[PDB]
Design a protein around this nucleic acid. Sequence first.
RNA 1: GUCUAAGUAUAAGCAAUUACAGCGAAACUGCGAAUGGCUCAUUAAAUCAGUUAUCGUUUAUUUGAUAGUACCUUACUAUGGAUAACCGUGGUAAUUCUAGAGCUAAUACAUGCAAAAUCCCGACUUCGGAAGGGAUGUAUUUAUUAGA
RNA 2: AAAUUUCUGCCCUAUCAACUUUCGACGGCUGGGUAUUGGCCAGCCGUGGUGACAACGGGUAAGGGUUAGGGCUCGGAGAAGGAGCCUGAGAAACGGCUACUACAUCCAAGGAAGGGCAGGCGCGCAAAUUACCCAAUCCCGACACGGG
Lengths: 42, 382, 46, 176, 174, 140, 226
Amino acid sequence: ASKGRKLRYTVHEKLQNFMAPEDRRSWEEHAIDRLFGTLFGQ
Amino acid sequence: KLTNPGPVPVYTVAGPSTARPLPDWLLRRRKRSAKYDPENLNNFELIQEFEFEEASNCVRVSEDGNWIMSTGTYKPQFHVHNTRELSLSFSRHTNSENVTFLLLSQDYSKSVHLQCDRTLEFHTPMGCHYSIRIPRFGRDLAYLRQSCEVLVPAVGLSSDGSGYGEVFRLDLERGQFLRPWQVDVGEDEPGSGLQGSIHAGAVNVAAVAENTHGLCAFGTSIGTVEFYDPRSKSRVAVLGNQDGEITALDYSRDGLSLALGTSTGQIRIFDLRNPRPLLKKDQGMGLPIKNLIHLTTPTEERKLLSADKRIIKIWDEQSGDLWTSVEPLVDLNFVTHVPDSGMILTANEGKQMHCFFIPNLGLAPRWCHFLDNLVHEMESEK
Amino acid sequence: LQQAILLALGLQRKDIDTLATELNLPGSQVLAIFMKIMRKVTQHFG
Amino acid sequence: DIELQKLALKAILTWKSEGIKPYQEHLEYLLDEARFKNELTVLFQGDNKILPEHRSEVIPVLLHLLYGRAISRKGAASGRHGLHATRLAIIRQLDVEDMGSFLDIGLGPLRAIRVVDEQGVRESVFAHEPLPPRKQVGLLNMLEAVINELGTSVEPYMDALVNSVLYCLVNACRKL
Amino acid sequence: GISRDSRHKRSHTGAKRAFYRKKRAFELGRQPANTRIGPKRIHIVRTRGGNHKYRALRLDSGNFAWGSEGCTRKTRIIGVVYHPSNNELVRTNTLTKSAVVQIDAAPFRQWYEAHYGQPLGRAAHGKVDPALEKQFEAGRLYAIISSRPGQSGRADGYILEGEELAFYQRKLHK
Amino acid sequence: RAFLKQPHIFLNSKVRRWYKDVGLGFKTPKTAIEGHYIDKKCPFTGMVSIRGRILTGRVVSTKMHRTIIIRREYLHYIPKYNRYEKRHKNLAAHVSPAFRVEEGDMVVVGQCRPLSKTVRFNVLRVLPRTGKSVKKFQKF
Amino acid sequence: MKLNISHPANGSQKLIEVEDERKLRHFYDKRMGAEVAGDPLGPEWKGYILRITGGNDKQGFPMKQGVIAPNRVRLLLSEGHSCYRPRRDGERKRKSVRGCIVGPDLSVLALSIVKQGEQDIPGLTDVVHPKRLGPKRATKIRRFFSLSKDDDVRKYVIRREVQPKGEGKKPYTKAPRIQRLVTPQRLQHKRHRIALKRRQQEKVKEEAAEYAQILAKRVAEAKAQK
RNA sequence: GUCUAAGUAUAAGCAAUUACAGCGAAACUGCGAAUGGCUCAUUAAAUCAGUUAUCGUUUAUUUGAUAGUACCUUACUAUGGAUAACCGUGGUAAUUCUAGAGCUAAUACAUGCAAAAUCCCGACUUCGGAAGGGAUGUAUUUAUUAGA
RNA sequence: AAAUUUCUGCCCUAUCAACUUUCGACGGCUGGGUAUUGGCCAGCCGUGGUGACAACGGGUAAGGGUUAGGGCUCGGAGAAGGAGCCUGAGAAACGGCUACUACAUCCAAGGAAGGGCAGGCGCGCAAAUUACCCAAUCCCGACACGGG
């Protein structure tokens, strides 16, 4: 209701096409999804 | 240009000589009315207007390394320099004292900053791309480059839904607030305002890597690090019960060993799967460490430790030995290094931003070649 | 890095260009570093 | 003289001592005429208060300079806000052992004075002057500031205080 | 871009309007002062009629009033305790107007034992309220800033006593 | 919150209540005199100054935080009809807790400085009448 | 790179053509204001040492002191700097400028001998050049001549003789109108100022006393009506 | 752009019978340029008009007044420095580009110690004029008291 | 001088009855800035506020005082384009600086400064001075003179 305190999920027109996603990542994703598997819990 | 220590000499080429300087108007008055004989040779500048007339908040050098963007306090603004040409490229102003910024592009063409008046403001060399007012107050910032999305910790509890605490997030190819990443801070007073309470209710630090995996590491004011994973949109880990508010959060060059630190001044180096600390150091006094990042001489690895008591200690990691320590004579709000080598830049509470050179760690950078000859001139002096 | 430079000319015996390439440096910076080397060996000698 | 005091302080720091070392910037900021009061409240009730270890090493130079700064007439204004509030705040923020050493340096000739003997009145003492009346009225202003900013704690110096003030009073009533 | 105008707002009828006029120099809004803890960092700015005001941003010592007995002294600042507006101001420890802040007790206790003489915080006219005496034995009282540090360059105010004292101490307990 | 206080009357003294008249033949009510409510926007309690315009009228809305609305009707002369045409207005004023507030009553209000976007005005006298809802109509 | 070397204690300056950058090699890597001996320059330069004060490179860009660069660097300059006179006041104009490091790329080098050697340079050390003006303030002249409190600086002035037009007339003397001279007129002006001061104050005293007796009379008449 | 008896003149500027004197290029200083008007999408009680109010505000310029503020442990004593213009050595291809070296002034920027001083009181009083009683500005901010 | 502010007065239209709360919409409390009052902005909560007496929306067709009369008087945005800054009593001058963009000038190729109205043509055939002075009135400045 108030000034900005509510997340008005409004599509922002100039804020729309700022930066293209740049996948700068060094590993092969299998290392890390096994890693997130056997983190502290496993 | 002086040197603080004996064995491993640091070299403050520039900075405030006096912790309590006079008013600059009276200073120039006494200058223009008084006869004085200063050391014209060894006292100099590298770069034009390396000050902010009250203090500064945050500095970064670009991925191209050619731009020095520094956010400063009085009539709040930001100085951007081309360090290739050793001068201000320009100096553009804002509406309140900035908290912290980040550069999107490899050059200065795209900047964003969290600003104290609940805002996230964007900047091109043309001018200002319009700011976004976040709902609740925040501390720090991180950027998902692989899928361009700014994320920001928030203090206090959420209004509806759960009572965890949140990390606001907005994608750059989408334009919307996607969803606040709910990170549990703890309990708060039910009879209060919507901004939370003073005693607790804060998520403080967030760290990520952008060459390795880059897990979303979060740090909150009960001394707790949490973890989220990109492409999962979900929490991964809750770990690290400590006493102080966790202020440091930084991945190493491998992407595995984490080096966090708590506001008691207690630094801990962890392995991502060993819950036991790889290393612990409780140093200085209780006045909180602010910034800790890894840094490498061309052979070895070492670590920064910046505590706001004018304490900047470079420690070793492989041995844990305190390699060096400097007293920058003033309170300081930000520390960087040159990723090339050599220089350690520090935005301060003082008038002039203060910077340092170390020869035993690295060389004079690619835009100041003769600084090696300057420290050689100091070597001829002593 | 002084020890590497001192190795690379004093016992590996090469030139400033291949030194610039090998340890990743633009120009006469290594020449200024050996000027420092000469300074320290002279302050030892005598 | 402020210039005399500044060259004096330069020779004081030419005496290289570890007691005077961590406060030398405070001494320079005291002698700098544009930061006197604020450098004083940097010295006291600041983070860098005086360490009691080398406090004995640091007291004489700072008390001497502080006396000279309370005496110097140039930068002072008119009225009470000229130099009276300065001496007021000085003795408000000084210590009682520091007050004893301060009165020690303040009383030049009357530090060792006797006004009462085994007899009643020391007329042989009273029929002489060591001082001009300018320094006498300055002495009385100093001790009035001492007594008013001290209160009760004036007991262990009384044997000098009453002798000094009563000599000045009896010289006054003789001159009237 | 910051100002004080009303052209961007709506009417009493709830209706908005363009009424677009360019922002002018008598409508000026100036950037705020976050007056925080540090050594003296005060700027001076000329204003309408060239009139200079003092924007303080870092301040160390303020003058505070024990005026129920008749003195005020320039003491150091410890840090903010509570701000009625914003917990974020309380977080970053900013000095604003009407801000309850802890301060030192040494020159006040010196004046007490210099005038009355009775030791305090360690006949009948010398009388300290017991909560104030708790502050005295703590050596760090609660005063309040009643000056505008951004618009006067200085932190002047009065010590907290009695009813407002218990009120704000209870609010600390809240 | 903070503590409500008369800004320059010394309370924490060991050894008053300031209330001023507005003049102009008005009487400070006893609730404004010694009633322990303190509000900076009341004329007798706070430091606001009434001057310039004096008005009256009928409340339509008592249900707001110390803010009523006066509906001001008048008979505007349309020349095309050669007639007097009823035109209601809507006014704004700050309500002191000093007066007893009724709905539909004739309330006397005087002008002070602007205290918000809307409020420039303060109650000085209330006349308790049996006025009905917005269906009623009278030139006033 | 040619060398303008000045002996400022002699008041003399001299540009000299200088070849042999081999002989100029020791000037390299030198900040301005730094001390370098002219002994490796030439045989007439034994014992000579000098500081470097400025210079202009090819395309004449001047060299600012205190800037760490060897190349030409684009700076921004405010009012009170050298190398730049401001087009208007309060003006910060951005301009390129050569850096402190004496590279190979210069055209001239500004130097000043701060200490001679035993040789004398036939055109630099040999010719004396006086200050064109002596001091004007009486305390300055008293300080130079070390005069006493009575010595009449008025006759201890320095005069200049000139020959005017009119087909070779008599010489004419010139004297610089000493500023800081107390004249009896100035003393009278001080007297006049303080006289107006005391006159103002006694007039306030008179009007206050007469207003006091007037108000006493008026309240006496008022309570007499009462 | 800007000069009057009333800012700073050693123009090695003119013109003459002793720090200075007249005329006076140059330079510093102070003032100026909140306008003269030009272009073009408009402004539908928001401007605008009457009508108030500032006990809610800033004001170079005008004239009117306008400042009691000593002493306050040195025991000793009508003050500073710059620099311009000026003289010279240059650079570059060079523009309001200017480097080095040497000068000098302020209404430019800067500091600033005689047993008196000045108030309020006055007992006694020959209008005598006074014993002797007390006291030492302004600007800023906060608190208190008075505001009869 | 500048700056807010009060009551009234807009033209037509319901193929415009819901609107505001969608940069708060209305309060009141607290802070920030402003020369000051002010949700003008920042924290706290309350509930609004307007409208069939015509809100809101649409349309563009953008008058007042001097009274026999007519006359006579007064009457938004930009300085190649966005963004930031600088003097002054007063400018957010369009006077300047800085960046970005876009032209575009000289060059010895390394560099360097800069962006106006008026006029004539506008088919190959056509039509009103390229006048002069500040003499008066008025305006600005160290100022009787200088400039408009």
